[PDB]
């Protein structure tokens, strides 16, 4: 989560972070893709019957 | 909220991840600097 890690649950910090744009929508998608891939790997290896 | 965080009016089936979850703290506690000895202003103000 960007909001808590970069900013200590502040408000002006959140407003300043809002200026950078989509530097988290890019980050929050790669991890979800990795998680989906990891969940698919074990299903591919074992589910063969 | 799911539509808002996806910038679209149509959402397909699945599980998504919306905004974070937090609990708002209430009230406040203020602590004075730990000094208690009183300044003796009685002598200067009241002297014989």
Swiss-Prot record, chain B:
Q: Name its species.
A: Severe acute respiratory syndrome coronavirus 2 (2019-nCoV)
Name of the protein in its database record: Spike protein S1
- Subunit structure, as described in the record: Binds to host ACE2. RBD also interacts with the N-linked glycan on 'Asn-90' of ACE2. Cleavage of S generates a polybasic C-terminal sequence on S1 that binds to host Neuropilin-1 (NRP1) and Neuropilin-2 (NRP2) receptors. Interacts with host integrin alpha-5/beta-1 (ITGA5:ITGB1) and with ACE2 in complex with integrin alpha-5/beta-1 (ITGA5:ITGB1). May interact via cytoplasmic c-terminus with M protein. May interact (via N-terminus) with host bilirubin and biliverdin, thereby preventing antibody binding to the SARS-CoV-2 spike NTD via an allosteric mechanism.
| UniProt-annotated stretches for the region Disordered | 22-38
Q: What does this protein do?
A: Attaches the virion to the cell membrane by interacting with host receptor, initiating the infection. The major receptor is host ACE2. When S2/S2' has been cleaved, binding to the receptor triggers direct fusion at the cell membrane. When S2/S2' has not been cleaved, binding to the receptor results in internalization of the virus by endocytosis using host TFRC and GRM2 and leading to fusion of the virion membrane with the host endosomal membrane. Alternatively, may use NRP1/NRP2 and integrin as entry receptors.
Q: Which residues are glycosylated?
A: 26, 28, 34, 46
Q: What is the effect of changing residue 34 to Q?
A: Reduced viral infectivity
The domain of life for this entry's organism is Viruses
